């Protein structure tokens, strides 16, 4: 599928990628470069 983000970009901090398996994989695919 698309490579996007589920929820707006603010939400999707650095801090959220790097400690938060949720928001990595699946909230802010996009901009924590998992797609």
Same mark, same amino acid.
């Given at each position: &599928? $698309? @490579? /996007?983000? =589920? /929820?707006? !970009? $603010? &939400?999707? =901090?650095? #801090?959220? @990628?790097?400690? $938060?398996m !949720?928001?990595?994989?699946? #909230? @802010?695919? !996009? =901009?924590?470069? =998992?797609?």
């Open positions: &599928r $698309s @490579c /996007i983000d =589920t /929820i707006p !970009k $603010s &939400r999707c =901090t650095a #801090f959220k @990628c790097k400690h $938060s !949720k928001y990595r994989l699946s #909230f @802010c695919r !996009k =901009t924590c470069g =998992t797609c």
